[model samples]
Target chain A: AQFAQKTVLDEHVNDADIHVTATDKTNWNAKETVEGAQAKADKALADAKAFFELSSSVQSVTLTPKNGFVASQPLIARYIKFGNRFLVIVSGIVGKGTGSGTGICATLPTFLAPDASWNKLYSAAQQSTAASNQANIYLSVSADINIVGVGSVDVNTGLDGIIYLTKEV
Target chain B: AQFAQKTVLDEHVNDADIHVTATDKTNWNAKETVEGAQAKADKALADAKAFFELSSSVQSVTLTPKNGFVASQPLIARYIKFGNRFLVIVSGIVGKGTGSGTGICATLPTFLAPDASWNKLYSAAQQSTAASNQANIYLSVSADINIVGVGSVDVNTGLDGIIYLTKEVTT
Candidate 1:
């Protein structure tokens, strides 16, 4: 059961400020009782919400190495920016070198005109040597993220490593 | 009984940021009316979106097998546009994974670039298999994802995997 009554905006449509809320019907008394017009408004509101939810737009930019931006290994990122925060997601096969983690990044998207505190949250599932590891890969989103190696000598000698970034705008 | 509408940004926000909007009557019929002059100005120029309930940036790159990606599993996803998708919301154990559930990935982050049906909806919850099990894994982001063993051998089995990112963008 919905457990509560879902009202509509029309009930208070003419009110200076409309308010919509719910009361718990999980107990014995209150059950959302929107019969005719109220029901119609409720459904309309719900549908609008669903549309907005799906319509919310997100800019997806594929990262690459250019002039100012450099890379140690071959790396790329899907950088996402929202408000004053930015996130870059990168995934690649775990290199076989001691410095495998070295080539884990590229350039920080200049859009946010970045700041500091850049870190790579990575996961290595069922590795050959370590079994499994959930560790923070040292990265440099400071300037050019994939400036090669920021945290380690090379990459982790695992099977694969997927990277996603987080820092302030 | 219109008591009071305590709307939660937490209820309408998560992930990365971009630009988008919502008109709700559940609050003050004005919905979330920014109630002021400058507030209105800020609202007029706000662009916060790029996906779903959870926000994140898209840094696309092709995978390489030589020193690159090898999907050791199967996965699928519904990519979000530059704005957002009609993704649903859910709350569960914020699984104490590394950096908190803030990290922890899977092989699914792959499959993306090679195809257009890519989505960033993912879940890197806490797990139990690894010793630290701060819970983190790596995978691909293929469209409706599905590839057998791209990296490791078996799937990283664990728990408290409260994650989003399904085969499709919205519910």
Candidate 2:
């Protein structure tokens, strides 16, 4: 165990396809041993200098946005960004074929952005991803989300993820 | 509520079986309060020094190699490599009957060894596992990732994803 002052992070991280760097400074200091990793950054933040004075670090940070923290929906909210917050959940499939999806936010970046344009953060129905499968269920959201979908399947592997929820925000 | 400057990373990582250390320096400084944990590592590093700067302390550390990062990959990227870069992306998908497995390396060593060989990251087709039988899909890959099945079941209760992803070409 150590850290009386260790600084070990080498750097590099690209977006839009993502490159990567930071393999050292002793493994970014082993990400502090990564168990709960930070227990949710340390229960989100009580104040370790307001989370180390915030600029985004833990190697890179991005994951806290809100909406009941991803409570409703089929369950799998799945969000990721790291360091600057794209709305962090990064993984949520509480469990259920899945109850909610096409409620498309795969984890944001304009909903994974390829030219994303869904329009409606909450409304709920479900149906995106090539639009063929039956329709798609995604059936829940509004708290501030605006998604819709409905139901369908047969192509793109169809769809039935039971949408669980690991934070819902 | 510490770490204005408090380093307490007790170390011991060698791989081959894996045993960990790093929960000492007063809980490694209680994890700097924990939110940004160390503030993303004191905002990337101006010499917060680096390697998470040491302290959430330890329980594991293996993933060091090729820019140590564990982006994208199931709830399993299982990170904690203190420094080296182990490919990063552990895994969790247990016991699916008759089909590839245990392949390991959701993150590892060998630097990033390659002349790699692992197939099928995506592209779905011959599927079916819906009560008449649900057919999970992982398709294929090697260098150590076999993962063949996702979820659903009638009998095979089939579902164990050892997972994989390796290149090792810095050799």
Using TM-score as the measure, which candidate wins? 1
Q: What does candidate 1 score in Cα RMSD to the true structure?
A: 23.4
Q: Which tens-of-lDDT digit does each residue in A121-155 have in candidate 2?
A: 21111222221222222322222232234233212
Model 2: residue A70 alpha-carbon error in angstroms: 12
| iRMS of each prediction | 26.1, 28.0
For model 1, what is the error of residue A51's alpha carbon versus the real structure, in angstroms, after optimal superposition? 14
The complex in candidate 1 yields a DockQ of 0.06
The second chain of candidate 1 has a TM-score of 0.19
Over 4 Å off in model 1, which ranges?
A: A1-56, A65-76, A79-81, A92-105, A112-121, A125-136, A141-169, B1-156, B159-171
| Model 2, CA-based lDDT | 0.29
The sequence of per-residue lDDT tens digits that candidate 2 reaches over residues B39-140 is: 644443433333234522333323321122122222233332222222233333323233232222133334332122323222121124342222223223
